[PDB]
Amino acid sequence: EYDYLFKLLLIGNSGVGKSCLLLRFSDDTDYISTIGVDFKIKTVELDGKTVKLQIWDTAGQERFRTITSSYYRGSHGIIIVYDVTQESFNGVKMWLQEIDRYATSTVLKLLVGNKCDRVVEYDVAKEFADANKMPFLETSASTNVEDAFLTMARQIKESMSQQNLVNLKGQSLT
Amino acid sequence: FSYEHYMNLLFSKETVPPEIAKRIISNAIAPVITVTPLFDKHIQETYKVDSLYMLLRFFGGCVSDRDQASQYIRFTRPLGLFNYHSLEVFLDNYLKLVAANTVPHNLLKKSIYHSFFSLAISSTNNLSPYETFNHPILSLIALDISNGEVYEDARDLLVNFKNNFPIFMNTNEMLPVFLLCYNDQEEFEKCQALAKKLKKQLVESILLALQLHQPVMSSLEEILFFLQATTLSLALINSIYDMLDYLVYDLMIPFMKRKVSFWEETILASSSSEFLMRKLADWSMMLSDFKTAYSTYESLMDFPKYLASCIEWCAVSLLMGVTVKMIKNDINPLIERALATYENCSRIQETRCMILASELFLSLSNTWTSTPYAIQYLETILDLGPCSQIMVWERLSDCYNLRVDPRIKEDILSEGLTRRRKAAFFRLIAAKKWAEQKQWRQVSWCLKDIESTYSEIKFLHGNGLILSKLKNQLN
Amino acid sequence: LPKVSQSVYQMLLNEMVPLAMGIERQISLKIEEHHTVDIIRSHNLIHELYKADEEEKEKVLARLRNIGFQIGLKLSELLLIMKFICRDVWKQIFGKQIDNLKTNTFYLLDYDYRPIQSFSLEEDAKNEELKMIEPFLEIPVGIIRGVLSSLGYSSEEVICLASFIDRAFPKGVSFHVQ
Amino acid sequence: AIETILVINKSGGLIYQRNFTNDEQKLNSNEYLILASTLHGVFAIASQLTPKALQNTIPYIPYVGMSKLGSFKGDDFFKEPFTNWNKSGLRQLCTDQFTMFIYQTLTGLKFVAISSSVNLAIQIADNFLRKVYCLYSDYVMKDPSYSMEMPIRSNLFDEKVKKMVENLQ
Amino acid sequence: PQYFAIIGKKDNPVYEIEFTDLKELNPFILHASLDIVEDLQWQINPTDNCYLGKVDHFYGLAITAYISYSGMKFVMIHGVVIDDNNMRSFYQEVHELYVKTLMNPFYKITDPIRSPAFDSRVRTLARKHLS
Amino acid sequence: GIYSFWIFDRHCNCIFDREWTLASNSASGTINSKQNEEDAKLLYGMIFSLRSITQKLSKGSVKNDIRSISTGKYRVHTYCTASGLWFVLLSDFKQQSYTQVLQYIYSHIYVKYVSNNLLSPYDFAENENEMRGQGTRKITNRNFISVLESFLAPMV
Amino acid sequence: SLKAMGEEIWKNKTEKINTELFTLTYGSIVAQLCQDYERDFNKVNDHLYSMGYNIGCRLIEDFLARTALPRCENLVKTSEVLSKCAFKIFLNITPNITNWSHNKDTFSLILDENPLADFVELPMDAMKSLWYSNILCGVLKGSLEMVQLDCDVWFVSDILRGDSQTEIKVKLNRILKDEIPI
Amino acid sequence: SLKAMGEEIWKNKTEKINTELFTLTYGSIVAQLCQDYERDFNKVNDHLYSMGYNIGCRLIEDFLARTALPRCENLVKTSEVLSKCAFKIFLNITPNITNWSHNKDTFSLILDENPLADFVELPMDAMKSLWYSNILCGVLKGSLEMVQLDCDVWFVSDILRGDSQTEIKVKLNRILKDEIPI
Amino acid sequence: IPSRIYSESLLFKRQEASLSAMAFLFQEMISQLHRTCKTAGDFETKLSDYGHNIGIRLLELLNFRASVSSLSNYITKMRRRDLKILDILQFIHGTLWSYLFNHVSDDLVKSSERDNEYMIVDNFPTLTQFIPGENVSCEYFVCGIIKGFLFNAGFPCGVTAHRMPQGGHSQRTVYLIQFDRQVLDREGLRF
Ligand SMILES: *C(=O)CCCCCCCCCCCCCCC
Ligand SMILES: *C(=O)CCCCCCCCCCCCCCC
Q: Residue C136 is part of a domain; what is its CATH number?
A: 3.30.1380.20
Pairing of strands E3-7, D110-115: unpaired
Residues in chain I: 191
Helix, strand and coil in chain E, % to nearest 5? 40, 20, 40
Contact F45 A62 (CB under 8 A): no
User: Do residues I21 and H90 touch, judged by C-beta distance below 8 A?
Assistant: yes
CA distance A134 to chain I (A): 29
Q: Which atom of ligand 1 is nearest to the CA of G70?
A: 2
Q: Strand D90-95 to strand D110-115: parallel, antiparallel, or no bridges (unpaired)?
A: unpaired
CA pair distance D36, H123, nearest whole angstrom:
54
Does residue B364 sit in helix, strand or coil? coil
Tell which residue, D114, D119, D120, D74, has the closest CA to residue D97: D114
Q: In what order do the strands lie in the sheet with H106-110?
A: H96-97, H106-110, H167-175, H149-157
**Which CATH superfamily, name and number, covers A4-160?**
P-loop containing nucleotide triphosphate hydrolases (3.40.50.300)
CB contact at 8 A, B288 and B268? no
* SS3 call for D95: strand
Compute CA A133 distance to the chain's CA centroid, rounded to the nearest angstrom. 16
Domain layout of chain H by residue ranges: 1-182
Stated as kind and residue range, the H or E segment containing E76 is strand E73-77
Measured between alpha carbons, how far apart are the two ends of chain F, in Å? 4
| E70: phi then psi, degrees, rounded to nearest 5 | -90, 15
Question: G touches B (3+ CB pairs < 8 Å)?
Answer: no
Q: What is the β-pairing status of strands A77-83 and A108-114? A: parallel
| Rounded distance between C-alpha atoms, residue D115 and residue D97, angstroms | 9
Q: Could you tell me the sign of the dihedral formed by the alpha carbons of H29, H32, H37, H38, in that order?
A: positive
Cα G62–Cα G68–Cα G71 angle in degrees, nearest 5: 90
Scanning D136-155 for CB atoms below 8 A from F yields none
Contact I81, I107 (CB under 8 A): no
Cα dist. B216→B63, B66, B97 in Å? Answer: 13, 14, 16
Neighbouring-strand partners of residue D4: D19, D114
**Sheet order of strands, A136-138 included:** A38-46, A49-58, A4-12, A77-83, A108-114, A136-138
Measure Cα distances from I49 to I141, I142, I151, I178 in Å. 8, 10, 12, 17
Helix (H, G, I), strand (E, B) or coil at D80: coil
Residue G91 CA: which ligand is closest?
A: 1
Contacts 24+ apart (CB under 8 A), B373-376: B373/B327, B373/B332, B374/B399, B375/B399, B375/B400, B375/B403
Measure G85 CA to ligand 1 centroid, in angstroms.
8
3-state secondary structure of B176: strand
Q: Which residues from chain G sit within 8 angstroms of residue A33, using beta carbons?
A: 180-182
3-state secondary structure chain I: CCCCCCCCCCCCCCCEEEHHHHHHHHHHHHHHHHHCCCCHHHHHHHHHHHHHHHHHHHHHHHHHHHCCCCHHHCCCCCCCCCCCHHHHHHHHHHHHHHHHCCCCCCEEEECCCCCCEEEEEECCCCCCCCCCCCCHHHHHHHHHHHHHHHHHHCCCECCEEEECCECCECCCEEEEEEECHHHHHHHHHCC
Give the Cα separation of A41 and A39 in Å (integer). Answer: 7
Dist CA A156 CA A161 (whole Å): 9
CA of E77, closest CA in chain B: separation in Å? Answer: 15
Three-class SS of residue B73?
Answer: strand
CA distance linking residue I150 with residue I177, whole number of Å: 9
**Alpha-carbon gap, residue A146 to A25, rounded angstroms:** 6
Q: Which residues are CB-contacts of B107 (< 8 A; sequence separation ≥ 6)?
A: B6, B9, B14, B15
Contacts of H53 in chain D (CB under 8 A): none
The conformational region for residue D82 under phi > 0 = left, psi -120 to 50 = alpha, else beta, is beta
Using CA atoms, how far apart are residues B279 and B282, in angstroms rounded to an integer?
5
User: What is the CA angle A83-A85-A86, rounded to 5?
Assistant: 95
Three-state SS annotation for chain G: CHHHHHHHHHHHHCCCCCHHHHHHHHHHHHHHHHHHCCCCHHHHHHHHHHHHHHHHHHHHHHHHHHCCCCCCCCHHHHHHHHHHHHHHHHCCCCCEEECCCHHHCEEEEECCCCCCCCCCCCCHHHHHHCCCCHHHHHHHHHHHHHCCEEEEEEEEECHHHCCCCCEEEEEEEEECCCCCCC
| Ligand number nearest to the C-alpha of G93 | 1
Q: How many CB atoms lie within 10 A of CB I121?
A: 21
Phi (first) and psi of residue B134, to 5 degrees: -85, -10
Contacts of B335 (CB under 8 A, 6+ apart): B312, B315, B353, B357, B377
Strand partners, A171: I110
Report the C-alpha gap between A109 and A135 in whole angstroms. 7
I83 contact partners, CB below 8 Å, separation of at least 6: E42, E44, E49, I154, I190
I30 touches chain D (CB under 8 A): yes
Q: Is A115 annotated as a binding residue?
A: yes
The count of domains in chain C is 1
3-state helix, strand, coil in chain A (%, to 5): 30, 25, 40
Closest to H27 (Cα-Cα) out of H119, H113, H91, H140? H119
List H residues 121-180 in contact with A (Cβ-Cβ < 8 A). 178
Distance (Å) from the C-alpha of residue I10 to the closest C-alpha of chain H? 9
Task: Provide the 10 A C-beta neighbour count for residue B140.
Answer: 24
| CA–CA separation, B167 and B271 (whole Å) | 6
Q: Do I108 and A174 touch (CB under 8 A)?
A: yes
Structural domain spans, chain B: 4-102+131-265
Of the listed ligands, the closest to the CA of G82 is 1
Closest among A51, A67, A61 to A4, alpha carbons compared: A51
For residue B103, give the DSSP letter: -
Query: Rg of chain B's alpha carbons, rounded to an integer?
Result: 25
- Strand D98-104 versus strand G106-110 pairing type: unpaired
* β pairing state of A4-12 and A49-58: parallel
Kindly list the distances between the CA atom of residue I164 and the CA atoms of B283, D156, I169, in Å, as whole numbers in the listed order: 82, 17, 9
The answer to whether the beta carbons of residues C125 and C159 sit under 8 Å apart is no
Q: Helix E116-129 crosses helix E84-102 at what angle (to 10 degrees)? A: 170
Residues 6+ apart with CB under 8 A from C104: none
For residues F63 and A26, what is the distance between their CA atoms, to the nearest angstrom? 28
Is chain H touching chain C, with at least 3 CB–CB pairs below 8 Å?
Answer: no
Q: Quick one: DSSP state of residue B8?
A: T
Residue B93: its H or E element: helix B84-101
Provide the experimental method for this PDB entry: cryo-EM
Give yes or no for E105 touching H (CB within 8 A).
Answer: yes
CA dihedral over H110, H115, H120, H126, signed as positive or negative? negative
How, if at all, do strands B175-182 and B204-209 pair?
parallel
Nearest to H181 among D43, D73, D134 (CB): D43
Are the C-beta atoms of E98 and E111 separated by less than 8 Å? no
For I30, half-sphere exposure in the C-beta direction (CA atoms, 13 angstrom radius) is: 26
Crossing angle (nearest 10°) for helices B20-28 and B108-121: 30
Q: Are C133 and C116 in contact (CB under 8 A)?
A: yes
The Cα-based distances of B73 to B111, B248, B360, G30, I147 in angstroms read 21, 8, 21, 171, 68
Which chain E residues have a beta carbon less than 8 Å from that of H121?
A: 104, 106, 115
CA distances from F152 to F99, F126, F149, G65 (A): 14, 30, 5, 19
Contacts of D98 in chain F (CB under 8 A): 57
Which of H25, H109, H144, H151 gets mutated to test ligand 2 (max ligand atoms within 8 A of its CB)? H144
Left, alpha or beta for I94 (phi > 0: left; psi -120 to 50: alpha)?
Answer: alpha
What are the Cα distances from residue F54, in Å, to A35, D31, D95, F64, I28?
16, 13, 7, 7, 42
How many Å separate Cα H170 from the centre of its chain? 10
D84, closest residue in chain F (CA to CA): F72
CATH superfamily to which I15-191 belongs: Trafficking protein particle complex subunit 3 (3.30.1380.20)
Cross-chain Cβ contact I132/D144 below 8 Å: no
Nearest to G112, CA basis, from G129, G128, G97: G97
**Partners of residue E74 on adjacent β-strands:** E6, E66
DSSP letters spanning A81-105: EEE---HHHHHHHHHHHHHHHHS-T
Collapsed DSSP state (helix, strand, coil) of residue B443? helix
User: Which residue segment(s) compose the domain that D140 sits in?
Assistant: 1-49+84-169
Domain total for chain E? Answer: 1
* Amino acid code (one letter) for D86: N
- Of all ligands present, the nearest one to the C-alpha of G54 is 1
Tell me if D13 and A54 make a contact (CB, 8 A cut-off). yes
In this structure, are residues E25 and E10 in contact, taking their beta carbons and an 8 Å threshold?
no
Answer whether D42 touches A (CB < 8 Å).
yes
Side-chain-side CA neighbours of G103 within 13 Å: the count stands at 6
Asked if I63 and E50 count as a contact pair (C-beta separation under 8 A), the reply is no
Query: Helix H segments across B227-331?
Result: 234-247, 253-265, 275-286, 290-299, 306-320, 324-326
**Which atom number of ligand 1 is nearest to the Cα of residue F82?**
2
Provide the edge-to-edge strand list for the sheet that holds G149-157. Answer: G96-98, G106-110, G167-175, G149-157
H-type helices in chain H, by residue range? Answer: 2-12, 19-36, 41-67, 75-81, 87-89, 135-145
Residue D71 resides in a domain: no
C23 within a domain of the structure (yes/no): yes
Q: Which residues contact C15 (CB under 8 A, 6 or more apart)?
A: C42, F118, G51, G54, G55
Q: Is A110 helix (H, G, I), strand (E, B) or coil?
A: strand
Report yes or no: A41 and A27 within 8 Å, Cβ to Cβ.
yes
Rounded Cα–Cα distance for residues B367 and B375 (Å): 11
Closest listed residue to residue B82, CA positions, set B346, B302, B344? B346
Residue G4 CB coordination number (10 Å): 9
H111/H96 Cα distance (integer angstroms): 7
CA dist I38 → A36, A162, G14, G27, I44 (Å): 45, 11, 82, 95, 11
Give the integer Cα–Cα distance in Å for G109 and G98: 6
Is A102 annotated among the ligand-binding residues?
no
Q: Flag whether D65 is in a domain.
A: no
DSSP per position, chain F: -B--EEEEETTTEEEEEEB--S-STT---BSS-GGGHHHHHHHHHHHHHHHHHHHHT--SSS---EEEEEESS-EEEE---TT--EEEEEE-SS----HHHHHHHIIIIIIIIIIT-TTS-TT----HHHHTT-------BHHHHHHHHHHHGGG-
Exposed (0-12), middle (13-18) or buried (19+): which is D99, by Cβ within 10 Å? Answer: buried
Residue F41 CB neighbours (<10 A): 22
Known binder of ligand: residue A36? no
Q: What is the CA radius of gyration of chain C?
A: 17
Which residues, other chains included, contact A98 with Cβ-Cβ below 8 Å and sequence gap of 6+? A68
Q: What resolution (Å)?
A: 3.7
Total length of chain F = 156
Within 8 A by CB and 6+ apart from I76, the residues are: I69
Give pairs for G164-168: CB < 8 Å, separation 24+: G165/G110, G165/G111, G165/G112, G166/G110, G166/G111, G166/G112, G166/G114, G166/G117, G166/G133, G167/G98, G167/G108, G167/G109, G167/G110, G167/G111, G168/G108, G168/G109, G168/G111, G168/G136, G168/G137, G168/G140
Kindly list the residues from chain C whose CB atom is less than 8 angstroms away from the CB atom of residue F147. Answer: 168
Q: What is the CB-side half-sphere exposure of residue A140 using CA atoms within 13 A? A: 6
As for ligand 1, residues whose beta carbon falls within 6 Å of it are: C 8; F 82; G 55-56, 60, 63, 69, 71-72, 77-78, 81-82, 86-87, 90-91, 136, 139-140, 143, 147
From CA B148, how far away is CA G32, in angstroms rounded? Answer: 200
